[PDB]
Design a protein around this ligand. Structure first.
Ligand SMILES: [Mg+2]
Ligand SMILES: [Mg+2]
Ligand SMILES: [Mg+2]
Ligand SMILES: [Mg+2]
Ligand SMILES: [Mg+2]
Ligand SMILES: [Mg+2]
Ligand code: NA
Ligand code: NA
Ligand code: NA
Ligand code: NA
Ligand code: NA
Ligand code: NA
Lengths: 1011, 1011
């Protein structure tokens, strides 16, 4: 038989699914959730051997350990140990599409383990082995005898081993196949790995056992009363003496208990379930669960003799909460949710797809620290510990079946096929059976990108029938089909329709009110955070808030899926698609995270944090209105710091305690601020600070901020009468200006400032020139490649229009000596193949103070694709340590992504002014800057800038950040105008019209002087 | 592997299901339904061997014919050749309830066949083998090599044999298992058999082939326009020159045709199906399909080339009809259906479960001849030919999946189990794929008696998704669960509620108007026709006609499941559960048919015919109001015969053509009749006769009848005053009377008329005594057995009250001589253990004309269960050939089943007064009789009677009809009153209160004389 090429065989001899078991024999240990002696971990060192095919595996390996084998850590992905290559592919299958067949060359991982079993385990009861995650299919032998087979890489596989194990030493033999018919339903946008990547354990259960238990909570109208209903099921001999006691604990206080014998109510004409019981406990004024306040109870389930012999005890954390969709709104405990979510893949730069507690906690700390309240299990059931953590810290979970068939043509070819229903159902049913008790899980998902098939309908109904407590969602086949309770599009824009045939992505605002439509809209995927992205993010959150039935979304995605590789010197670097010899690959498309692989934040993460704020603010005179977006909690760990500053210089500050009811408001009256004499703009800045530590944040954490412009005094005082008059020297090649120790040189052949002198030292390595192009972002490139050009993408439009190779023809270059200054006037035309793209007219005015006033006026042709930027650049000879500016900061910001930025006097070391995006591009811009200080230099005006050791050319010519070499000096980019970054998706033009440079005629002015 | 003990494996290497194929290579042959050279029948003589288990099957059988094996006919059940015993069990499984395991002793049927192929089939193409029916699971080998495995006894299993076939002799090897995990989903109340019981054939398709097609017909508001929609799917190498033409034919006239290349519309973000095409044909004024008028079109699907080379063609019959539920009603072509239905099992007394064309035709003819318009496929998909015949003759079909888990505890144990969804799905999905193109199939059914589980809901949805054309129904778990579009209870009563816990069977009238309920009600099973049954059938049909949303039901059931056995003499006799040594067995519960196994009518059939009439009548003066219950057809093959009779003697008659439109009315004026001068009751009997022969009926067929009482002239003249005078002889022991040669003897100890003489010849072999009991009907017994008494059952109630062994204590016996007569007055008390149950007070009067007038007045105790009858009985010495009577007839009729009966003079041979029920009981009664003639005797009055060679005693002491012997002379049972027979079900008291003998005091009078 070839079971790994048969969608009719998804397992052999596998035990039934169920919620997390520990088989406690003491009820207090169950209650306290302390470790169980009946649940052993088999994690540790195993013997591993790699083979090109299952046929290649030597018959002796079943009976005896192989000498060639190596000792490896388990859990692990065998790609991470370097046995074969991890493959990154986006849509296209890593194998030839020929269901259900896989290549005869199938990388086979032979794991083994010699382990010990106590006599006591074999003298009584049942001894089983649980494999939490095996990718993608595996056969299991024990002591040489075959046990079974199993598929689905993301759910536990369990087998009874009692009749196989002997006292003391035993040996496992797990032959794991990389490819199987299972792989056809596992086509997620991620690294294609394999092996025993989750926990392995041994569970001893009594013969007469708890085989399943469902916990439910239902509520009276105002949620002041609840009935906890627990349905318990058993295996073994049914006897009159059997009972179940379900007790409910709140810390140490037992709030409810119920005891009944077995034998459920009459179900049908043949009776009821004699092997079942339902316990109903009344709970007065229950503490409710939410991501805001994750109140938990502990439910202990005791199977026992009536006379008081505990046979075994299972347990779980209970969260009293209700999820329902009413009148088109998704409600948690009667209140409409606002999903501040992110899509999270299980990824580690070093370990691949093996999850650990430390990492999982770090993710949840960071998510909650950045105002996320939800997470999508994209696109599979997660590690069991994740759901427990979300229960405890507080995050709404979308639990998603392991069904992705994205590379099928058409996408629903398998999911419409009734012969593929058995395999699909197990990915849905065994998910529900495992996780249905977790309070954190609020929504079920039928998978991702598998079109819409009749199998989606059958399964949707199955979950509705089995579990009435949670809405079922699914995006495939149009995101509003009969398979989903929530409209859940991916990358639907706020206002713009993308009306594809059959599966249009309507404006989310437009979608809600289509003829006959009523359901809530929460995007399963939005704001593609690929490279320099997240532009246009605020547009989403303005809409989410304005529209009741727009209840948020899940950002794509959490972490960059980059992997650590090592160079000739042994130095680590972040690698992506293709870097492991893997081909075909979708290159850097695996990196779309708000955080890097090592969990270092991208600059976009702060933009998400600002938008997902839980407190809204308005200003009216001296009164600040604070509005709470919390649904259940009071502002009981919050105060408001406020700061008024004249262009960076602190004027007045104070603290006011935040006392806002959920959905409520607080009017905070500011003290009469004494206005200053000196000119400038007053800036109010408020920050919500948490004075006290929490489970998720430290004392002094900042949860929210906002800024306003207050009064402005425009400067009417002019500089003093100049102490000298600058001299001009004329040559055929050059205009040269001299004043004190300052010197300027304008080349008359080129028409640019080609050198500058402070004292006697050079100041330039490259002349000051106009620049209308940028090192293309990931959103600029889209899907375009050298082999396969996408002409619609921005980068190709600029290339084809000739923007990158257009050369400056000089039209005018003159010098005039004024009464107190010298005036250099120039004009340039940028041309490509007989087409004028840009004209740049400048005046440079240099007076007796030592200041150079540059005035730029640029014309852009209407029929040329809008330029990336409209500015200047040069390579300064200086290399300073610090960058000091008055403008938006501290972090990187761009026109369509600058709401999180605040205007203040910022001071950073040079290296921070560069964002190390793994795929190098235009980066580190700071907008709305009025003054920039770098070493001896000061620039003043109203500009946008970046400043680093790397040129735009080097940036656009390098594919990985580690290959970047610091150039001589410092590359300075000062733009009057910069195009938006986009990011609604990363495969088609996504920069909004209002952030495109399309005015035709642009003006900006800079003053360059020594500070 | 043990593949027959694993629900996860239901097939191995099996091909996809699909509508009926023939791989026609000529388009005209396809249009005309003529045979295809590409479809060979492998029916005929096979080689067969039997084994106790699969382990017992010798390994040589795979490549070599076993010498011990026999030559048998296939299709066949191996129980029918006597290899082992067929088992009849109703609910309790024929195997130990141990899912998924079956017995180690598992009877194995080894089938083999040596065959040859055409040369060209070896050259090229796809040669598959089709197994239409294998019970219950099998492995297939070809030329020694293993091909595949299959399950589900009631749907075809297909396997490709292309790579297995060779030149010359080829050999198949089929190992058939009686028990399998599939047995758990196949617990229908029926004989449990096994083997290859449906057709075996070979189909040679091209490699580029039509692999699937679906035909849909949708309409405008008035059905004057239709769009026929044909989606066609292909397999093989796609080519640009490939086309599909779907042509529509009305006889030899092409009405619509459509041609297209491959490649359907865009479905999702990955495109459309390149291997598919949908053809849309406009059809003006389509001839519509119904049971009344089965208008059929022919659609031909041609896979051809653009230049005009046919590759292959498929085809089906098309019936333009629309099924929808609107406003609570089931509509067919916009008109509310009235389902005159029956359940039909696939049964034959000799061939077991093998179906033949002749039998299937014989059933449909009889069904249609008895006013049925609908059939339920209880409880499995049928032999392919049943659907074709139903299309062509016109019968509404409920197609039912092969899923019955009746003996589970509780009934839904498997069906609520997600681990049984895979195996369940295939039984539903492969059914729809096979039968969806049939116009006869109006309703899909999810199975029968399997409780209600999540799987039902999931599978319900799957069909609603895949085929919106047809409603989905299912009865399990309370007949109104979320898994049914129709309220479809089994054995719910008209007015009486049976408020069972969890699964009540409400009054069908009450059920409709339950709070919130809107759906239509059609009983999937009603009126249990077990033995002498169908009492209270008219109550259903009155309710069906009055209540729009009561739309009928399916009678249980069509045919007795009795098998032919043979005695040592060689005589055939009808056998039931237990008669093959089968134990546990459910005895006679397999026979619940309106006909015997050989399709001979039970009396109950004529009652079903009468109540399911399509013409309703009312009388007003001399005017008959005839109303058509037809929805679509005009009365175009009908004329009315009206007959007027004075107590049997014809008075006036005539003919009137019926010109009634559907739902229309007609008035027929009767010519003023001769007013009879002589006394008596006038009767009117109208008949609807079909002058012309049809496809389903002979010329002169009677389809409807009705009777009325017209004017009555009561008799006022007294009988001729006689000359002679009866002479009394008194004795201690006897009272005797003489008149002429006629003589009467009254025993003064017993109090009964013990003998009668005419000349020397004596008239009685047993005294004339009171009878209060009957030989218990199947509806009297129910489930009650000797080993397990059901005290609630009617028979047991009588038994316990001592009705059967009560003795006649004589209270009074006096003789008086009158002026012209002798008067014998008696009084008897019936007592069991000191309790007087009955008292009988009689007066016998013998006058000078030799006429004996009996007056009977009975008292029944109120605390005793109501008596089965109140009458007299005796054994006459006479054996005459004829029975001539004036009353209801000619067929057997009972108080709650006498509507089909008609009042007239009836004359039948004696054996016709007996009804040969396989399980004998009270039978052959006729009610409302005013005169009875037998030999020299005549009885007059108003009585109910049966007359046979079998005593009530023998009938109740004899368990099989073939064991009955004719007793000396003739037994006569004249009842003044007879209890209803019942039959709403056959496991609890079902006789309606108005047909129970509960008046406490009863009167009746008979006149006995000798003409
Ligand atoms: Mg498989
Ligand atoms: Mg306790
Ligand atoms: Mg590639
Ligand atoms: Mg603002
Ligand atoms: Mg099986
Ligand atoms: Mg009548
Ligand atoms: Na909202
Ligand atoms: Na991606
Ligand atoms: Na680059
Ligand atoms: Na009706
Ligand atoms: Na039956
Ligand atoms: Na009997």
């Amino acid at each position: 038989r070839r079971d790994w090429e048969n969608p009719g065989v998804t397992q052999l001899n596998r035990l039934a699914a169920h919620p997390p078991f520990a088989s406690w024999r003491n009820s207090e240990e169950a209650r306290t959730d302390r470790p169980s002696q009946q649940l052993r971990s088999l994690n540790g060192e195993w013997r591993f051997a790699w083979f090109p095919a299952p046929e290649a595996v030597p018959e002796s390996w079943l009976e005896c350990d192989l000498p060639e084998a190596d000792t490896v850590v388990v859990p692990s992905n065998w790609q991470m140990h370097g046995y074969d290559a991890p493959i990154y592919t986006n849509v296209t299958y890593p194998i030839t599409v020929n269901p259900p067949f896989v290549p005869t060359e199938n990388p086979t991982g032979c794991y083994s383990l010699t382990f010990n079993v106590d006599e006591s385990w074999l003298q009584e009861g049942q001894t089983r082995i649980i494999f939490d995650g095996v990718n993608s299919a595996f056969h299991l032998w024990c002591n040489g005898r075959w046990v079974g087979y199993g598929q689905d890489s993301r759910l536990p596989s369990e087998f009874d081993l009692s009749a196989f194990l002997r006292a003391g030493e035993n040996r496992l033999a797990v032959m794991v196949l990389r490819w199987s018919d299972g792989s056809y339903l596992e086509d997620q946008d991620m690294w294609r790995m394999s092996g025993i990547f989750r926990d392995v354990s041994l569970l001893h259960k009594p013969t007469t056992q708890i085989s399943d238990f469902h916990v439910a909570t239902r509520f009276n109208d105002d949620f002041s009363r609840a009935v906890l209903e627990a349905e318990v099921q058993m295996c073994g001999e049914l006897r009159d003496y059997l009972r179940v006691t379900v007790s409910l604990w709140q810390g140490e206080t037992q709030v409810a208990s119920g005891t009944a014998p077995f034998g459920g109510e009459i179900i049908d004409e043949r009776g009821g379930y004699a092997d079942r019981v339902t316990l109903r406990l009344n709970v007065e004024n229950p503490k409710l669960w939410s991501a805001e306040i994750p109140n938990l109870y502990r439910a202990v389930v005791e199977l026992h003799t009536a006379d008081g012999t505990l046979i075994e005890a299972e347990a779980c954390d209970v969260g009293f909460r209700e999820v329902r969709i009413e009148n088109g709104l998704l409600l948690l405990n009667g209140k409409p949710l606002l999903i501040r979510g992110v899509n999270r893949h299980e990824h580690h730069p070093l370990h691949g797809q093996v999850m650990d507690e430390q990492t999982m906690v770090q993710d949840i700390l960071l998510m909650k620290q950045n105002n996320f309240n939800a997470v999508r299990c994209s696109h599979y059931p997660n590690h069991p510990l994740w759901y427990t953590l979300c229960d405890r810290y507080g995050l709404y979970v979308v639990d998603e079946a392991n069904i992705v068939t994205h590379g099928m043509v058409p996408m629903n070819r398998l999911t419409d096929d009734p012969r593929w229903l058995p395999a699909m159902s197990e990915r849905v049913t065994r998910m529900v059976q495992r996780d249905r008790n977790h309070p954190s899980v609020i929504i079920w998902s039928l998978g991702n990108e598998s079109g819409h098939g009749a199998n989606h309908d059958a399964l949707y109904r199955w979950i509705k029938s089995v579990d009435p407590s949670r809405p079922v969602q699914y995006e495939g086949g149009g995101a509003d089909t009969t398979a989903t309770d929530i409209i859940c599009p991916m990358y639907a824009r706020v206002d713009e329709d993308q009306p594809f045939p059959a599966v249009p992505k309507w404006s989310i605002k437009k979608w809600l009110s289509l003829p006959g439509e009523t359901r809530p809209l929460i995007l399963c995927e939005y704001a593609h955070a690929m490279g320099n992205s997240l532009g246009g993010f605020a547009k989403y959150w303005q809409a989410f808030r304005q529209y009741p039935r727009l209840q948020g979304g899940f950002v794509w995605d959490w972490v960059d899926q980059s992997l650590i590789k090592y160079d000739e010197n042994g130095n680590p670097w972040s690698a992506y698609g293709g870097d492991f010899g893997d081909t075909p690959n979708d290159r850097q498309f695996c990196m779309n995270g708000l955080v890097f692989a090592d969990r270092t934040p991208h600059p976009a993460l702060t933009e998400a944090k600002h938008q997902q704020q839980f407190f809204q603010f308005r200003l009216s005179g001296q009164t600040i209105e604070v509005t709470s977006e919390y649904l259940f909690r009071h502002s009981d760990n919050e105060l408001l710091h406020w700061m008024v500053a004249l262009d960076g210089k602190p004027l007045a500050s104070g603290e006011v305690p935040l006392d806002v009811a959920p959905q409520g408001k607080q009017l905070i009256e500011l003290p009469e601020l004494p206005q200053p004499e000196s000119a400038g703009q007053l800036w109010l800045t408020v920050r919500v600070v948490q004075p006290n530590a929490t489970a998720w944040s430290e004392a002094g954490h900042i949860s929210a901020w906002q800024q306003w412009r207050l009064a402005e005094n425009l400067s009417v005082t002019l500089p003093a009468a100049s102490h000298a008059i600058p001299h001009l020297t004329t040559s055929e090649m050059d205009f040269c200006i001299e004043l004190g120790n300052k010197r300027w040189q304008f080349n008359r052949q080129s028409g640019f400032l080609s050198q500058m002198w402070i004292g006697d030292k050079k100041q330039l390595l490259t002349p000051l020139r106009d620049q209308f192009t940028r090192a293309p972002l990931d959103n600029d490139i889209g899907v375009s490649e050298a082999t396969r050009i996408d002409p619609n993408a921005w980068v190709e439009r600029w290339k084809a229009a000739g923007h990158y190779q257009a050369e400056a023809a000089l039209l005018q270059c003159t010098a005039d000596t004024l009464a107190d200054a010298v005036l250099i006037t120039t004009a340039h035309a940028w041309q490509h193949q007989g087409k004028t793209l840009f004209i740049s007219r400048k005046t440079y005015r240099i007076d007796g103070s030592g200041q150079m006033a540059i005035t730029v006026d640029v014309e852009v042709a209407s029929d040329t694709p809008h330029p990336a930027r409209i500015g200047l650049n040069c390579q300064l000879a200086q290399v300073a340590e610090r960058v000091n500016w008055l403008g938006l900061g501290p972090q990187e910001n761009y026109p369509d992504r600058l709401t999180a930025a605040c205007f203040d006097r910022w001071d950073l070391p040079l290296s921070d002014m560069y964002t190390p995006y793994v795929f190098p591009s235009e980066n580190g811009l700071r907008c709305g800057t009025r003054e920039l200080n770098y070493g001896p230099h000061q620039w003043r005006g109203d500009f946008q800038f970046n400043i680093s050791r790397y040129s735009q050319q080097q940036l656009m010519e390098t594919s990985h950040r580690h290959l970047l070499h610091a150039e001589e000096g410092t590359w300075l980019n000062i733009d009057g105008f910069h195009m938006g970054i986009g990011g609604d998706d990363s495969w088609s033009p996504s920069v909004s019209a209002e952030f495109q440079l399309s005015a035709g005629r642009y003006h900006y002015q800079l003053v360059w002087c020594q500070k």
